[PDB]
């Protein structure tokens, strides 16, 4: 599996997601607060899922060849199986933090599923020009998600416990910056215009994935906002 130059970044991402999973797992031992237990369960599952998908890419299972532009292009499809389950869980962490209504949550998860789903179709589309149609629809779904997090949650977090509002605003800022980089990497990477080579693209996604899953988890699980206000 070492014939692919990007293997070094897949192995490092695999290791980092594995160590993050174990850290959150041990850290969650003994926590009895029901509210904190919810956040630990959601947040520990995120790197655990990504660990299995990074391992599958390292071993070569999560890779396929897609013909477009007159060439057989290597497409790591396992990323979308990862994101299909981890991006909803990350949104749920934010929504539960601000106690969002059930209707708003369904809208976020539904739009998230469309965003990843259309991204997958664009990744496997064989007509080159059609790949960017799916990219545009996926990006429009992400912009809807970002809009809700700003003009829907922020207005309700400010009316909550101060520790909750401060942690949400930090995680919301982190989320907006990191998530917005994904469509850009896709567009200029091997899946899109092919300006950046695959080995560099893999490096970019690895830094983003670890930050958005482990880094995001470190900020949340160290806050007092996940525990109920008790004496
Ligand atoms: C916090 C501690 C960790 C901090 C570390 C964060 C590093 C992330 C930086 C990445 C971009 C890497 C850019 C490397 C560019 C090499 C490209 C190259 O030389 O070939 C390109 C090819 O010719 C086509 O133009
Ligand atoms: C080298 C290590 C590689 C990386 C590790 C391999 C990951 C795959 C294995 C196991 C799933 C274990 C459980 C995952 C679910 C975590 C949920 C949790 O622990 O939540 C605690 C909550 O407080 C309770 O009520
Ligand atoms: C709260 C919700 C929790 C959700 C927990 C779910 C986590 C499942 C994780 C991983 C395995 C992913 C395996 C995906 C199966 C792909 C197999 C396939 O279709 O391969 C086709 C063909 O054989 C080859 O290209
Ligand atoms: C809308 C309400 C919520 C506001 C939230 C603010 C965050 C906005 C950020 C990003 C969208 C992603 C933009 C990605 C489009 C990049 C395409 C591009 O410009 O590429 C040019 C050229 O092809 C290469 O040199
Ligand atoms: C696991 C970490 C996070 C933050 C994953 C986020 C992924 C996305 C925001 C992906 C977006 C895409 C779009 C909108 C357009 C191209 C296809 C993608 C699925 C990469």
Q: Give 34 Cα–ligand 5 centroid separation in angstroms.
A: 31
Residue with tokens 């959601």: 42
> Is residue 62 in a domain?
yes
Resolution (A): 2.0
C-alpha 31/C-alpha 26 separation (Å) is: 10
Residue with tokens 């009895």: 32
Structural domains in the chain (count): 1
CB burial of 159-182 (b: ≥16 within 10 Å; e: otherwise) equals eeeeebbebbeebbebbeebbeeb
One-character DSSP codes across the chain: -TTSTTHHHHHHHHHHHHHHHHHHHHHTTT---HHHHHHHHHHHHHHHHHHHHHHHHHHTTT-EEEEETTEEEEE-THHHHHHHHHHHHHHHHHHHHTT--HHHHHHHHHHHHHHHHHHHHHHH-SSHHHHHHHHHHHHHHHHHHHHHIIIIIHHHHTTS-HHHHHHHHHHHHHHHHHHHHHHHHHHHSTTTT--S-HHHHHHHHHHHHHIIIIIHHHHHHTSGGGS----
> Is residue 1 in a domain?
no
Q: Is the CB of 181 under 6 A from ligand 4?
A: no
CATH number of the domain where residue 53 is located: 1.20.1070.10
The residue segments making up the domain with residue 207 are 7-226
- Specify the residue with its C-alpha closest to ligand 1, atom 15: 200
List the beta bridge partners of residue 72: 67
C-alpha 160/C-alpha 19 separation (Å) is: 33
Q: Is-contact 100 156, C-beta < 8 A?
A: yes
C-alpha 180/C-alpha 150 separation (Å) is: 14
C-alpha 174/C-alpha 216 separation (Å) is: 8
Question: How many whole angstroms from its chain centre is CA 61?
Answer: 21
């Amino acid at each position: 599996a070492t014939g692919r130059p990007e293997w070094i970044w897949l192995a490092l991402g695999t290791a980092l997601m594995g160590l993050g999973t174990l850290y959150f797992l041990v850290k969650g031992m003994g926590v009895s607060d029901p509210d904190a237990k919810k956040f630990y369960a959601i947040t520990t599952l995120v790197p655990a899922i990504a660990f299995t998908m990074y391992l599958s890419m390292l071993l070569g299972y999560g890779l396929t060849m897609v013909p477009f532009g007159g060439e057989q292009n290597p497409i790591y499809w396992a990323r979308y199986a990862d994101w299909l389950f981890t991006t909803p869980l990350l949104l749920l962490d934010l929504a539960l933090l601000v106690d969002a209504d059930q209707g708003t949550i369904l809208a976020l998860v539904g739009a998230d599923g469309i965003m990843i789903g259309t991204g997958l179709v664009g990744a496997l589309t064989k007509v080159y020009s059609y790949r960017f149609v799916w990219w545009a629809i996926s990006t429009a779904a992400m912009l809807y998600i970002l809009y809700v997090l700003f003009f829907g949650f922020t207005s309700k977090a400010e009316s909550m416990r101060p520790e909750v509002a401060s942690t949400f605003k930090v995680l919301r800022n982190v989320t907006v910056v990191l998530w917005s980089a994904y469509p850009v990497v896709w567009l200029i990477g091997s899946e899109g215009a092919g300006i950046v080579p695959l080995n560099i693209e893999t490096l970019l996604f690895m830094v983003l994935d670890v930050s958005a899953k482990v880094g995001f988890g470190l900020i949340l699980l160290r806050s007092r906002a996940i525990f109920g206000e008790a004496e």
